[PDB]
Every structure is written in C-alpha cells, then in structure tokens.
Ligand binder design. Structure first.
Ligand SMILES: [Ca+2]
Ligand code: NA
Lengths: 63, 281
C-alpha cells in the first residue's frame, strides 16, 4: 500500500495511526494543505497535508 | 579526484565544457530551502531569505536546496561532483523552511527578488497541486522580464488520463521537467500530462549535501536543475539569446523518447541546444 485515499477527512491522529500500521518505518511529516513543498521523492516519507482543523485534506501517499 | 555524475554526462554538458562554456557570468537563482555556502564544492554569489523564522539563506536546514544547487553549479575542481554549469553565479533564494514547505507568498517574494536582482535563470524544484492567480502572475512577470523559469513537473506519477503536473510547472510560461533514469526510462513517480515539457535525469542523482557531504537523491527536483544548468550553459555560449530562444533551443533539440503525455518532448541535449541550427536527435 502506497496511497491512503480512505484517510481524507479523518483526523491527523487517526491517519498517523493507520499509516504506521501499514508502514511502521514511515517518516511522517505534517504540513498545512495549500503550501508549496520540495519535489524530492523519498520512498520512506509520508507527508500528511492538514486543513486548519487538523483533518487530512489531500490523499496521503509515499514520496 | 572529482567525479562527473551520470546525469551531467547524459545531457551532454561535457560537450559544452570542452567548447569552453561553463555558465560564466550567468545568474541562476535556486529558489528552494537555502544553500550551504560553506560547502567546498559550491560557490554562492548572493541570495536572500523569504522565510520569516529562518533568515539566513546560506544555511540550509533541510538539505534539498544544497543538492539542487550542486546539480546546477558544483565547482569544476579536484573534489566532489561537477555541476552542469560549474561557473554560474549561484544565488540562494530561500523560500522553504527546515520541513521542506513554504507559503505561496514566500515563493512569490522569492520570484520577485530574482526579477529585481536581474537573475537570468530561476530553478524551482518545488510545487503544489493548486495554483493561485498571484503565483501565475509572478512567474508570468519573470518570463515577461526575460528570465528562463524552470520547475520540477511533480512526483504524482500517473492517474489514468488526468494530468498530474503540479504548479508552478503546470503554467505555460514555466518549463515543466519530468524525470528519467540512466536508461532514459521515465521514473514511476514522474508526473504526467500535456504540460510536461522535457525530461532530465532524476534517479539516483549524486550531488552536494550540507556539512561537506554528497549523496544520491531521487525526484523531479533532481531533473529540474539539469535543465536550469543547461540554460546557463546555453546563455554563456549565446549571451544575447532571449529566454524565448533558450527555451526553444532546449525543446527543439531533445532526444525524443515515448509518448509526449509521459515524456514531453524527450531528454534534453544541451550540445544540440547550443548549436545555431536545431533538430532532434
Ligand atoms: Ca567539483
Ligand atoms: Na509549464
């Protein structure tokens, strides 16, 4: 599993828990939705983009 | 001894070096996370930070901007790696913080600084899924002002028939760059769509990292600075060519690869780009 569309709209807390069950070594980074980010690709990384309420606002994926 | 990373060879940059052209007097802004100016394989000419809590553009707390800068312009000497345009005047325009992210207004302020400081080339190894009117206006203004603007296409891979190129790469005024490996195969993560313009090496790319280190990174972030460095080589050989002409020269002399949806016009070839007469090889 490398994408989690089922997590959109969930809390950032539940998303972290789910992704760490699927990918226990994941380096998770929480960022505000609507920011600009680097375009490196890191198979170990999962960025979580949250809205101002701390809910997931974009499909999480590895990279 | 110095090493020439495979991607520098693959775009035929050594052909320009042997003609005597290495990007001298061409100003390239790396709009990114900063550049570690203490690295012995980089020379940073100037810069500015738009990140409110990280005010020093010559400190790179992420590592990403430093790697991107070395692909553009790592020095020609007896150490480390060689850059595409090793004599270019390199500017650290810091708009991303330690965590690799920045507000749209920070990126825009950086593009404005580049315009005001007469940069010839901007590299933006960065992006997001949505645009804004103000972001489009900033890149359009840079191009109207004569700057070559190059950006990573994005690492969203495929999504059926949909474009997955992000912004600012997706804007017509910006050259959007996808990633291939050493065999010219598209990297599986490389974004796709009719906005994809050209490809460059973006798999296992060795470059400079902060604290006098080197390392291999992957991404359309790594592909973009091959093309920004190529633009600087071309301008050092043809200092009167406009950004329009530099962009056309790179587009018109690619080595065509697959369908343009996945590969754009193909792999850049800076040897062919820097001739007067252009055709694809
Ligand atoms: Ca060197
Ligand atoms: Na574009």
């Amino acid at each position: 599993k490398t994408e989690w569309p089922e997590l959109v709209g969930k809390s950032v807390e539940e998303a972290k828990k789910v992704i760490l069950q699927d990918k226990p070594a994941a380096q998770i980074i929480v960022l505000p939705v609507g920011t600009i980010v680097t375009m490196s690709y890191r198979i170990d990384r999962v960025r979580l983009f949250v809205d101002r309420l701390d809910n997931i606002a974009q499909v999480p994926r590895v990279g | 001894a110095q090493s020439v990373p495979y991607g520098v060879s693959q775009i035929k940059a050594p052909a320009l070096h042997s003609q005597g052209y290495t990007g001298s007097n061409v100003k390239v802004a790396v709009i990114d996370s900063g550049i570690d100016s203490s690295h012995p394989d980089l020379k940073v000419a100037g810069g500015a930070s738009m990140v409110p809590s990280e005010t020093n553009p010559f400190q790179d707390n992420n590592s990403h901007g430093t790697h991107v800068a070395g692909t553009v312009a790592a020095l020609n000497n007896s150490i480390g790696v060689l850059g595409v345009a090793p004599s270019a005047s390199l500017y650290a325009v810091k708009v991303l913080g330690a965590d690799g992210s920045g507000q749209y207004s920070w990126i825009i302020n950086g593009i404005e600084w580049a315009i005001a400081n007469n940069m010839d080339v901007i590299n933006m190894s960065l992006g997001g899924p949505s645009g804004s009117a103000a972001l489009k206006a900033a890149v359009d203004k840079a191009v109207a002002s004569g700057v070559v603007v190059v950006a990573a296409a994005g690492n969203e891979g495929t999504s059926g028939s949909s474009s997955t190129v992000g912004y600012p790469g997706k804007y017509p005024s910006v050259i959007a760059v996808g990633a291939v490996d050493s065999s010219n195969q598209r990297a599986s993560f490389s974004s796709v769509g009719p906005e994809l313009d050209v490809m460059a090496p973006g798999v296992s790319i060795q470059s400079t990292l902060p604290g006098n280190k080197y390392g291999a990174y992957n991404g359309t972030s790594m592909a973009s600075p091959h093309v920004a460095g190529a633009a600087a080589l071309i301008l050092s050989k043809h200092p009167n060519w406009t950004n329009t002409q530099v962009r056309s020269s790179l587009e018109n002399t690619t080595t065509k690869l697959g369908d343009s949806f996945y590969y754009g016009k193909g792999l850049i070839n800076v040897q062919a780009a820097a001739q007067h007469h252009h055709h694809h090889h």
